[PDB]
């Protein structure tokens, strides 16, 4: 069918640490999964946002994960 109740984006696990270098780059640490808002620029770096920040990120320090259900595992 059709889904019209999403409104958001996917995530992507930051495999290592890193920071924003370009004026439009994004920073993150090892384990800081970001929110892929888009995929502009090269086909190797994504576009995402960490709870407020955003910008390009080299996918080599990342992986693309789906939408998880809540974080509380206990």
């Amino acid at each position: 069918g059709s889904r019209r109740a999403s409104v958001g984006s996917m995530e992507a696990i930051a495999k290592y640490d890193f920071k924003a270098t370009a004026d439009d780059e994004l920073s993150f640490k090892r384990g800081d999964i970001l929110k892929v808002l888009n995929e502009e620029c090269d086909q190797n770096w994504y576009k995402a946002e960490l709870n407020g920040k955003d910008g390009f990120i080299p996918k080599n320090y990342i992986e693309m994960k789906p939408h998880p259900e809540f974080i509380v595992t206990d």
Partner: peptide
Amino acid sequence: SPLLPKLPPKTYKRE
């Protein structure tokens, strides 16, 4: 090429 470099654009190998 090795691991976590400056992310260079690949091209060819050593052979």
